[PDB]
Amino acid sequence: RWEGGYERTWEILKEEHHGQVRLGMMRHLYVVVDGSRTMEDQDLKPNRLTCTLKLLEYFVEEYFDQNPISQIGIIVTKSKRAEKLTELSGNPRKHITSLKKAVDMTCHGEPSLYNSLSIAMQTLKHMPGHTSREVLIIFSSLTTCDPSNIYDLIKTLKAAKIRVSVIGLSAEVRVCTVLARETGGTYHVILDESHYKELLTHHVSPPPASSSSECSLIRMGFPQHTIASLSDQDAKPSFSMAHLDGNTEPGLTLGGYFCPQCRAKYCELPVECKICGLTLVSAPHLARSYHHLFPLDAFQEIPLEEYNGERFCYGCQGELKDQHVYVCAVCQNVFCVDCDVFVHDSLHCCPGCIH
Amino acid sequence: SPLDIYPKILDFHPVTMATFTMTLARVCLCPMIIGRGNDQVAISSKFETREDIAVIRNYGNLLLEMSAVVPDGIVAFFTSYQYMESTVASWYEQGILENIQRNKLLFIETQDGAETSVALEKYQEACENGRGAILLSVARGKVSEGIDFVHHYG
Amino acid sequence: KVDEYGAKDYRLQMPLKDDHTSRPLWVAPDGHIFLEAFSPVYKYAQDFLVAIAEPVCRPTHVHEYKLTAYSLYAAVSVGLQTSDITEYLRKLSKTGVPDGIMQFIKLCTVSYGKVKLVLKHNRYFVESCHPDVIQHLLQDPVIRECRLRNSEGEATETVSFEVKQEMIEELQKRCIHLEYPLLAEYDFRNDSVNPDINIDLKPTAVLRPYQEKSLRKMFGNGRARSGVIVLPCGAGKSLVGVTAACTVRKRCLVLGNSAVSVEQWKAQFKMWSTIDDSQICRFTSDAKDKPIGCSVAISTYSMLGHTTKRSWEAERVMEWLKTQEWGLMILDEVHTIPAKMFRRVLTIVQAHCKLGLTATLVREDDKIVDLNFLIGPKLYEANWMELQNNGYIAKVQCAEVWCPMSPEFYREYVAIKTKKRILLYTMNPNKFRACQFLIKFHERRNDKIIVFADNVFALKEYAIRLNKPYIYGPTSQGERMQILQNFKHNPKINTIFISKVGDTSFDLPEANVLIQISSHGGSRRQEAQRLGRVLRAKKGMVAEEYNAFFYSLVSQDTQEMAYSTKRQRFLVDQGYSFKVITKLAGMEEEDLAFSTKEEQQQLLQKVLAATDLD
Amino acid sequence: DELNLLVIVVDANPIWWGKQALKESQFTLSKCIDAVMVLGNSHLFMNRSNKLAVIASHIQESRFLYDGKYELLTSANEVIVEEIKDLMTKSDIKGQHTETLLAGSLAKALCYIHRMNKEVKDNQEMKSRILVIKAAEDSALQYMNFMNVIFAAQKQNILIDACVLDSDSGLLQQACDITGGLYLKVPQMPSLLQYLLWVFLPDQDQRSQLILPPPVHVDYRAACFCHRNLIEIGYVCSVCLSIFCNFSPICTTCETAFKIS
Ligand SMILES: [Zn+2]
Ligand SMILES: [Zn+2]
Ligand SMILES: [Zn+2]
Ligand SMILES: [Zn+2]
């Protein structure tokens, strides 16, 4: 009955560090990726699968950058089955290649969290107690099929002291919430792609060590890059043990890295020696996680008008024109917003404190 | 909601009649009204319009989307048992109900409380076992009387 | 004033004001108005210009509308006065409004709403509150002949007078010459002579915003007013007609081109209207129903325009119709009305409100100005690109595929200067191979293929060679319906050849691939209408900007090029673009007909066998 | 769009140059400053898009340095000449600290690079490299901060080139190895400028086609904390990552007893 009259004339009118606590020095991380029909949804452009795997590659990059002594295993739960997409190792290149291959996969079926968790538990059953057992699960669909009781698996994980953290995509799941809370992990929910990146970056950082965490004196070796010269009579080219693992013919390299314990030859580091089990590392790899030992505390924020001092940043000599000034606790220097952000995020050290 | 009807019904004068408004630091409730279907069909539950197949299909589509989106706990209250049974039969004939069952498991109460109690127990166990469970009851059935929901149930 | 470059120097008469960005309108004194779609005030200006101006061009950015006396009268019938419109123009015109444009509006607005025509007791009365103009109209000898007089020859005497029904149309042309257009106002609620009809709107009916807006424009002040509405094919035009009929609820008459359209309308009313089926009758030559109790009638122009002797029952139906007073009448494909026989139907039928619905209005015979008085001003015409963006209609992907002529064909093409030359370029073997490749491509793509070919012989030859169903002149109705239903459902059949009959003689099942081979010769309205009818919105490809595919096979260097360019004029005016494609990738890999030269030579023999007689 | 920034860090230890002046050798600090200024002038000379950032690393603190001659180059040089004389005239040794504040200057350089990169137009890409010249002895305590600087630079993918004059520093060797930068000791200090031009001036992409001296082998031995002696295989703490040659039941650094049955 709206047909009586209609006019728009009036519309035409003029107008987060914890305390000094022990963390996960040794990490055995397994990533669980759902492969159900819900992964084809376009919640994150273009779809969940592509954005999720790109963020996974970035996460692996950052995780290996900050945790040289960690390990990564990739599991995809598809069609109510669990498939170990990538073997547990420390190579970023293999993980990136596997993720790129999995980018063009097919998402079908339903997730089977029980089977994936069972596979992870079996894999991490034989790991040493001092090494931390961490599991990350990406849950797209809100429902899963389990051939057996999952609470028994929860008890098994609790007895094995395995930490599991889940980042759901649509909404919170009570069973996953209980699992994460009991295993000591953290449960989160994706708000957007930026929040996804934030959660992944937060999970890159080592988790605090619980009271049950062991403290054992592990022995490690640090070989040099033994390079042989063909002019020398002592130049023995030999195929890399890791390169023997592959189908392509291994490269006969003149020198490389030899195990100090059993003279095992490897072209890639830091990798634990396969023969004697010794972990062959390098000094920068150990020092790569030192910043976690001494986190950089947040500086005091005082606006420029309230700060009666130098108008030049101590970090970049830039004239302080920003509305906020960040002053250190120790040396009480002057840093602009950009320098303060970079120091806290990446540098983790104050220039005056060094001075 | 009406503070004055009860003194009239019970024929007495309560000394104090105060309603305690709820203050939330976090908005835990999202009451929404959806009277327009996917095809913009006017949604109603009048007995004249209860037999409309279009409203049945709109309800089926809404239920399917809710199961595909909302978490495991789903409860749907109809107006009468006979209308609910007719709608369920229509959905089964339409074939939408199969997709709804694929998304989340389906549970429907009946007249007998004993079998209804077993159905409710199965629904709660499915909700606690991570598999989506959907309950279909009537506003005057036993569910609205003495059945309470935990956060993951409601 | 004209510059040496051909542009008319309007700088002197258009004093610019500094409100450039805020004001989005340019008002040229020629009557053309330009609007920028990127302006933040586009929507308000668009709505304002729709009522007051007739659209000319609606491309992506800069839209051009035109001002006509008919547009001004339509705006007045909406209920907008001169002052508000002028103020809004000034608030939107970048420069000063020319006085001649202002004077033109002043002249038109005052003369509007003066003369009123009322049909009561099968008598037409011309009335006005100003007898001075009425007395002045008595002077016209044409009016004197048109004005009803006594049987003795004496003319009859708020004062009105009866008018001869058979002289109405000639009077209407005289009103423009008298500069006093008729006012087609209907007592939507005040009618008492014609009883209502128990017909309502079923809840399944939904009115899209543009549909409701057009209906509200039609129903000025709550009163139904005769007019013309342009709706793209597949925009629920039949739904709009059913909605208007339900709204008026008075005696409703609908006219269609063929009985197929009649059946479509009957199904629509059964689909949306609440009227009883017993009150619905079709005045068709095959399916006959008694006019008694027929609350809503659906008929065809030929049945009413059958000047030759009809059936005795048809005589009774015509007598009942003449006796019956029609509050509302509905006309489809208004572009067909300017024909004399169909125009006579308007005189035959006594109806109060007459609304015409169609997809196009560009008659190649330019017989549309007189049509403004046959029915009324164009009430509304939706933006096709806007409905594309809104997702109401499929976004058509249009291509012009150039097929070089075979030199032997081309030599004969130059040889013939007569009408026989059509068969030369309409039967290009290279065009045949291109069509075969496209058909294979879309069948592998699993799409519905509709091949439009005006020439009967060419269509039959193509269909027989490709072993596909063909539709032509006779097209026995049972076989036609059988083939259509096979096409809709049977996956084995997805390529249908349809001759000229596919425009309006029957409904076209929804498809996605439309290939046009043969042209009428420049029927820019007919082929555009048929294209719009063929392609409709398809689910699944909604997100993509190209969900509908249309291809026109044009013989290069032929007179077909000029015809294609003239034809696509209207579609370009509608913002539709046509990309020219010469080289078809994948043809060389595929094996197609007429691969060898003598095959094309044999086809040339076959075509030349069809001489000028055929 | 190639915005190439060439960061120059100078070992401005007064002790080493004072001793060299006492030696009355062919090379002096003035020659080093002139060579640095010439290198920066050539860097800005190669392309307008190229930018220069020069910071002087003195023991007291780190100073941001920046007639037939180019006017802008003349102004920049006179600015730099003003800065170095200003520092040297006020260069007062007050304390027993001798190691150069190497890490702090690098941190300031990284912060400046980050600031400029934020100011870089998004239509252009900013390749950044840092050149450091080593004259005096290396610093011991700055090891943790030096490693942090290396990690941050590798995260931001900034090449770091170290130039040795007299004293070799394995820390600089490892820094150039990790960062991919070029490390070399110049024996003829007066010829030093050419080594900057022949090696350090060309960009890494240019260096690819060019034939370059082979990289020096770099070692990564580890010293056990209880005696700071290099070893092959050692026992690493699982808590504070301390290295112990002899098996211990209790860690000395994090004060944690090892729970071994
Ligand atoms: Zn070994
Ligand atoms: Zn700064
Ligand atoms: Zn500080
Ligand atoms: Zn320790």
Short mmCIF file of C-alpha atoms in Angstrom, two decimals, chain C residues 50 92 215 240 258 304 309 363 368 422 427 464 521 576 609 614:
data_model
loop_
_atom_site.label_atom_id
_atom_site.label_comp_id
_atom_site.label_asym_id
_atom_site.label_seq_id
_atom_site.Cartn_x
_atom_site.Cartn_y
_atom_site.Cartn_z
CA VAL C 50 14.74 10.28 -13.73
CA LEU C 92 23.04 21.15 -8.89
CA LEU C 215 5.03 1.51 -9.28
CA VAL C 240 5.10 -5.98 -12.07
CA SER C 258 1.19 -14.67 -29.02
CA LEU C 304 -8.92 -7.92 -31.30
CA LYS C 309 -15.04 -11.79 -40.21
CA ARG C 363 11.27 2.10 -33.21
CA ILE C 368 7.10 7.05 -30.85
CA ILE C 422 22.22 -11.57 -48.12
CA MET C 427 26.55 -18.43 -45.43
CA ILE C 464 21.21 -29.93 -40.45
CA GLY C 521 19.20 -5.57 -41.50
CA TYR C 576 27.17 -2.38 -23.02
CA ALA C 609 21.34 -22.95 -56.29
CA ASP C 614 14.35 -18.49 -52.57
#
